[PDB]
């Protein structure tokens, strides 16, 4: 009857590669990637 | 039974009244038509 659902622009495989880069920047850098260059820190030392 | 009907009353099947066959029904195609222009100050080419 003239009604049509349009597809989303970001596939669900692209929305999961953005969620994987946010979890691999926190586990390996800290809160340093959201303010400038990402700087590495041993993990037990970021929890400290 | 002679007709046929999905949920939303919509005949989705019928049965020849001269040979008795169950012939499904499916609407003719339709949809939108979008036009991709690079810009008329750049080109008069387009994709659809």
Q: Tell me the chain B residues in contact with residue A4 when contact means C-beta distances shorter than 8 Å.
A: 31-32
Cα gap A12→A7, rounded to integer Å: 11
* Interchain CB distance below 8 Å, B31 and A4: yes
- Residue in A15, A46, A45, A20 with CA at minimum distance from that of residue A31: A46
Please, which experimental method was used? Answer: cryo-EM
Tokens of B20: 């008795």
Cβ atoms of residues A32 and A39 within 8 Å: yes
In this complex, do A2 and B30 lie within 8 Å of one another by their Cβ atoms?
A: yes
For residue A35 the two structure tokens come to 């303010």
């Amino acid at each position: 009857n003239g009604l049509t659902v349009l597809p989303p622009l970001l596939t669900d495989e692209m929305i999961a590669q953005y969620t994987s880069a946010l979890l691999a920047g926190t586990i390996t850098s800290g809160w340093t990637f959201g303010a400038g260059p990402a700087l590495q820190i041993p993990f037990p030392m970021q929890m400290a | 039974q002679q007709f046929g009907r999905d949920i939303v009353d919509t005949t989705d099947a019928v049965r020849d009244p001269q040979t008795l066959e169950i012939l499904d029904i499916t609407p003719c195609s339709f949809g939108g038509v979008s036009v991709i222009t690079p810009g008329t100050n750049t080109s008069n080419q387009v994709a659809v």
